[PDB]
Design a protein around this motif. Structure first.
Motif, short mmCIF file in Angstrom:
data_model
loop_
_atom_site.label_atom_id
_atom_site.label_comp_id
_atom_site.label_asym_id
_atom_site.label_seq_id
_atom_site.Cartn_x
_atom_site.Cartn_y
_atom_site.Cartn_z
N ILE A 99 0.52 -1.06 0.03
CA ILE A 99 -0.13 0.14 0.02
C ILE A 99 0.97 1.18 -0.17
CG2 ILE A 99 -1.43 1.26 1.18
CD1 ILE A 99 -3.09 -1.68 2.00
N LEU A 100 1.72 1.06 0.51
CA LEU A 100 3.26 2.21 0.85
C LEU A 100 4.02 2.56 0.12
CD1 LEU A 100 2.91 2.18 4.84
CD2 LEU A 100 1.94 4.74 3.65
N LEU A 101 4.58 1.11 -0.66
CA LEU A 101 5.71 1.95 -1.59
C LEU A 101 5.27 2.51 -2.68
CD1 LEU A 101 8.31 0.29 -1.97
CD2 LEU A 101 6.95 -0.99 -3.86
N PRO A 102 3.62 3.12 -3.33
CA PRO A 102 4.16 4.00 -3.89
C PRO A 102 3.84 5.67 -3.53
CG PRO A 102 1.87 2.22 -4.23
CD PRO A 102 2.70 1.74 -2.98
N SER A 103 3.61 5.45 -2.08
CA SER A 103 3.37 6.81 -1.33
C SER A 103 4.69 7.44 -0.85
CB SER A 103 2.50 6.53 0.05
OG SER A 103 0.91 6.78 -0.41
N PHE A 104 5.61 6.05 -1.30
CA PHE A 104 7.14 6.88 -1.06
C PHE A 104 8.07 6.74 -1.95
CE2 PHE A 104 5.75 5.83 3.22
CZ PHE A 104 6.32 6.90 4.20
N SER A 105 7.66 6.36 -3.49
CA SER A 105 8.22 6.50 -4.40
C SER A 105 9.33 8.14 -5.04
CB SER A 105 7.25 5.52 -5.99
OG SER A 105 6.71 7.01 -5.36
N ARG A 220 -9.21 12.85 10.57
CA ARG A 220 -9.60 13.00 9.30
C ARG A 220 -10.33 11.69 8.24
NH1 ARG A 220 -5.35 12.75 5.29
NH2 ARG A 220 -4.41 14.56 6.91
N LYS A 221 -11.03 10.41 9.04
CA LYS A 221 -11.55 9.63 8.63
C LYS A 221 -12.77 10.57 8.48
CE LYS A 221 -11.93 5.43 9.02
NZ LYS A 221 -12.49 4.37 9.66
N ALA A 222 -12.59 11.24 9.68
CA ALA A 222 -14.24 11.70 9.29
C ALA A 222 -14.61 13.22 9.08
CB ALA A 222 -14.39 12.48 11.03
N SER A 223 -13.42 13.68 8.84
CA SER A 223 -13.59 15.69 8.12
C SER A 223 -13.68 14.70 6.48
CB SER A 223 -12.19 15.98 8.10
OG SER A 223 -10.90 15.49 7.49
N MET A 234 -3.20 5.70 2.95
CA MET A 234 -3.44 4.74 3.93
C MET A 234 -4.93 4.97 4.27
SD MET A 234 -0.35 4.48 6.65
CE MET A 234 -0.05 6.15 6.93
N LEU A 235 -5.44 5.62 4.37
CA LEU A 235 -7.27 4.88 4.25
C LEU A 235 -7.85 5.18 2.79
CD1 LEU A 235 -7.62 8.53 5.96
CD2 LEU A 235 -7.48 6.38 7.18
N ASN A 236 -7.29 5.53 1.84
CA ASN A 236 -7.59 5.90 -0.03
C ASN A 236 -6.73 3.72 0.10
OD1 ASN A 236 -9.23 6.98 0.94
ND2 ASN A 236 -7.95 8.41 -0.15
N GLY A 237 -5.92 3.40 0.52
CA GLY A 237 -5.38 2.48 -0.26
C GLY A 237 -5.44 1.09 -0.24
N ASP A 247 -6.16 -1.45 8.34
CA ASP A 247 -6.85 -1.10 9.02
C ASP A 247 -6.13 0.19 10.19
OD1 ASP A 247 -5.63 -1.63 11.33
OD2 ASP A 247 -6.98 -3.84 11.31
N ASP A 248 -7.62 1.17 10.88
CA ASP A 248 -7.14 2.13 11.80
C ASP A 248 -6.05 2.25 12.62
OD1 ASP A 248 -8.81 3.57 10.00
OD2 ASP A 248 -10.15 3.71 11.72
#
Ligand code: HEM
Ligand SMILES: O=C(CCCCn1ccnc1)N[C@@H](Cc1ccccc1)C(=O)O
Ligand SMILES: CCc1ccccc1
Length: 451
Positions: A99-105, A220-223, A234-237, A247-248
């Motif tokens: 999930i996080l690899l593309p967030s860190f590329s 963040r989930k609420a807003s 992470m919330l959307n991945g 999970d949270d």
């Protein structure tokens, strides 16, 4: 028979790490004992590897997997099954990794760049605003930079470290939890009442971190806001393999993990880089000339930061000498012989990165000299000779992030200030779980280049 340092009766080698500077103690042991030494503690055996020859083998992921060092195991009490403190075989590792690899590329850095610039500019502005009589507490300010950068890019949170001298409450707890994790390494009889209040404080710090981070996630989930930050990702991945999102709870662990990583671990790189720059004015001049030539705009663009090749070499050379995540642990996946001489049974090795990076058989005899030109051609670096970001699939996911923020701010620092090692600072490396040139101070004289 494997070399092993001096022992302390039933404590075996454990008291050798009961020192303010355990990594440096281990480096000295490595200098004395060589490329491998056994380190025994009550109920623990590991083998510290210092040569590229052995470490290259240890980095064979078909033979060795990441082990949680005792430090990581204790940090796991608050970093949970975040990426750093998860075993490779734990479901949440690969899941979060995917999930996080593309967030860190490197490409993801383009999206974080503006937030990194935000904090980098605050750093530059702080130093632009110092009075002539004043100096910079380098690691402190680098930590302000790196913490705020990961806060902003991690979850659009402003730690506002340039607005306070006192740490954020989360950071107070994180630092104290990390300190307690490091202290527990030397703790005989952990359930003794002497370490009792440490436990109460540790649990309180874990709760602080969890509550604060859980609240970040819940807010963040609420807003519903869709920031371009790690939390949104992470919330959307969705992990393509399991098909599952994090999970949270795991997101919280990831956030805690990123905050740990992006705090003094990352700021140490900047602090050491600036240390070496001020100790090596020729290097500083070369780096400053690049910063001046490349960073032609009031704020650096991502593309310009990528052109800061020599700044990157400076950072790599700082990582070579004082990698701020100085060790990682591996375990033999099966019985295997290391280096043709050291039979290992299935199940630990410690890669002593500072020693790997001083392997004269790789780097030449001048290993202690700060020479970024060693990195002028990345082709000249043999595989596994340079591993400040660890190894393989368990390598630092934050490597591009750390290097981008470090290159950006170091580039800006070099563009905007001349630096004076006004105290002729004597390198004194304070060890926590990371390394910092403690008390490193400089004066920065503004070149009066506007932002
Ligand atoms: C100069 C700065 C940094 C250095 C030297 C560094 C170094 C390392 C090293 C050596 C490892 C492997 C640890 C092990 O094998 O036990 C690692 C893992 C990791 N680092 Fe970093 N790190 C840095 C900055 C960061 C930053 C800024 C982040 C995120 C915001 C980060 C996130 C991680 C994560 C998540 C892992 C675990 C990756 C995985 O196992 O899947 N690091 N880092
Ligand atoms: O191995 C780690 C911790 C690894 C953490 C590095 N890291 C990983 C991700 N980000 C940073 N310390 C070394 C050295 C040591 C020994 C005793 C006390 C403190 C330090 C060791 O245990 O021998
Ligand atoms: C998250 C980086 C880390 C974790 C544990 C110990 C040291 C450093």
């Amino acid at each position: 028979e494997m070399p092993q340092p001096k022992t302390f009766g039933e404590l075996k080698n454990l008291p050798l790490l009961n020192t303010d500077k355990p990594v440096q103690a281990l480096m000295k042991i490595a200098d004395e004992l060589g490329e491998i030494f056994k380190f025994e503690a009550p109920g623990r055996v590991t083998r510290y590897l210092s040569s590229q020859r052995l470490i290259k083998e240890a980095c064979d992921e078909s033979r060795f997997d990441k082990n949680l060092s005792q430090a990581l195991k204790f940090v796991r009490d608050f970093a949970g099954d975040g990426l750093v403190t998860s075993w490779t075989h734990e479901k949440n590792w690969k899941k979060a990794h995917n999930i996080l690899l593309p967030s860190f590329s490197q490409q993801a850095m383009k999206g974080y760049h503006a937030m990194m610039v935000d904090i980098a500019v605050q750093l530059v502005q702080k130093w632009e605003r110092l009075n002539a009589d004043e100096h910079i507490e380098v690691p402190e300010d680098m930590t302000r930079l790196t913490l705020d950068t990961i806060g902003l890019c991690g979850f659009n949170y402003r730690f506002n470290s340039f607005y306070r001298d006192q740490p954020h409450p989360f950071i107070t707890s994180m630092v104290r939890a990390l300190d307690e994790a490091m202290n527990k390494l030397q703790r005989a009889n952990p359930d003794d009442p002497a370490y009792d209040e440490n436990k109460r404080q540790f649990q309180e710090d874990i709760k602080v971190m969890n509550d604060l981070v859980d609240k970040i996630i819940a807010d963040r989930k609420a807003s519903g806001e869709q920031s371009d930050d790690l939390l949104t990702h992470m919330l959307n991945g969705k992990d393509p393999e399991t098909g599952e999102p994090l999970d949270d709870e795991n997101i919280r662990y990831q956030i805690i993990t990123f905050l740990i990583a992006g705090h003094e671990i990352t700021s140490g790189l900047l602090s050491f880089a600036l240390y070496f720059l001020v100790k090596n004015p020729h290097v500083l001049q070369k780096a400053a000339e690049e910063a001046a030539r490349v960073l032609v705009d009031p704020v650096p663009s991502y593309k310009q930061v990528k052109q800061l090749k020599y700044v990157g070499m400076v950072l790599n050379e700082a990582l070579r000498l004082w990698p701020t995540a100085p060790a990682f642990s591996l375990y033999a996946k099966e019985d295997t012989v290391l280096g043709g001489e050291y039979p290992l049974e299935k199940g630990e090795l410690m890669v002593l990165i500072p020693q790997l990076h001083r392997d004269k058989t790789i780097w030449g005899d001048d290993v202690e000299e700060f020479r970024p030109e060693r990195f002028e051609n990345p082709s000249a670096i043999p595989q596994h000779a340079f591993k400040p970001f660890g190894n393989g699939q368990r390598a630092c996911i934050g490597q591009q992030f750390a290097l981008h923020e470090a290159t950006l701010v170091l580039g800006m620092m070099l563009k905007h200030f001349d630096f004076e090692d006004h105290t002729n600072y004597e390198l004194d490396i304070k060890e926590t779980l990371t390394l910092k040139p403690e008390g490193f101070v400089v004066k920065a004289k503004s070149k009066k280049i506007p932002l």
